């Protein structure tokens, strides 16, 4: 992403929506739901907050943090080597290696009995209140505004209170800014493109970046002169 994420609160999006005299029955309560539906459906990794925590494993099981949404990696605490996901169908089950993990809910299922792991995960930025804190980026703000407008105009079209050309134009005006908001948060910066250029340009290829925490991924690959 080129732009930094400045955070502003959720009632920023209702300054914009209640400029429209047909969207004047929106609350924060609908916008709390319709922003979580937008933060999720875009899947933008520059919106979530990267946190790292050390959890300990009791017997192939560990308690996972409460604010987790997506795990980046899980590495051992003593070695530092990272755990691949588990393909095993019979993990902790006994009969009569490269370690792996698996997560469903608030549980992580590991392949090792008694250890400590680090978890690099992602969470939502919150407030003094317990509320989502969204970017200030006016392309993220404008397609979030067109999202809640499209989801409020759909109810007003199903009720028979909005013409077919008004929902058709909002569905078109949003679908441009949804593809645009993808490209704001995805396209690498001038600094992030050197991390790709030093990864894409490798005379001797580096294919074991997952054992480290992708630390040496963007390192420039130097060759000696003879």
């Amino acid at each position: 992403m080129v732009n930094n994420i400045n955070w502003v609160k959720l009632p920023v999006i209702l300054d914009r929506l209640l400029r429209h005299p047909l969207l004047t029955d929106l609350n924060l309560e609908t916008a709390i739901q319709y922003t979580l539906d937008f933060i999720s459906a875009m899947g933008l990794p520059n919106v979530y907050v990267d946190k790292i925590e050390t959890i300990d494993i009791k017997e192939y099981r560990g308690e996972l943090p409460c604010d987790l949404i997506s795990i980046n990696q899980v590495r051992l605490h003593k070695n530092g080597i990272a755990l691949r996901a588990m393909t095993d169908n019979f993990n902790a089950y006994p009969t009569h290696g490269e370690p792996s993990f698996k997560t469903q809910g608030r549980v992580i299922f590991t392949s090792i009995k008694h250890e400590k792991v680090d978890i690099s995960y992602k969470a939502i930025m919150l407030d003094d209140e317990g509320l989502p804190l969204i970017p200030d980026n006016p392309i993220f703000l404008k397609t979030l505004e067109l999202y809640i407008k499209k989801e409020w105009f759909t109810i007003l079209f199903d009720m028979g209170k909005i013409s077919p050309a008004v929902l058709n134009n909002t569905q078109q005006e949003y679908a441009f800014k949804a593809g645009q908001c993808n490209n704001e948060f995805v396209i690498p910066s001038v600094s992030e493109m050197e991390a790709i250029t030093n990864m894409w340009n490798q005379l001797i290829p580096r294919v074991t970046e997952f054992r480290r925490g992708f630390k040496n991924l963007g390192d420039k690959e130097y060759i000696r002169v003879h």
């Binding site: 028979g160 013409s163 077919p164 050309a165 058709n168 134009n169």
Partner: peptide
């Protein structure tokens, strides 16, 4: 005599169907 609360809403509902049809022909 006089009462105009059904001839209103039957003339008003006649006018919804004109404009709901008129906005149904609007194409960008």
């Amino acid at each position: 005599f006089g009462s105009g609360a059904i001839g209103y809403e039957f003339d008003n509902r006649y006018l919804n169907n004109q404009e709901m049809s008129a906005v149904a022909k609007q194409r960008l």
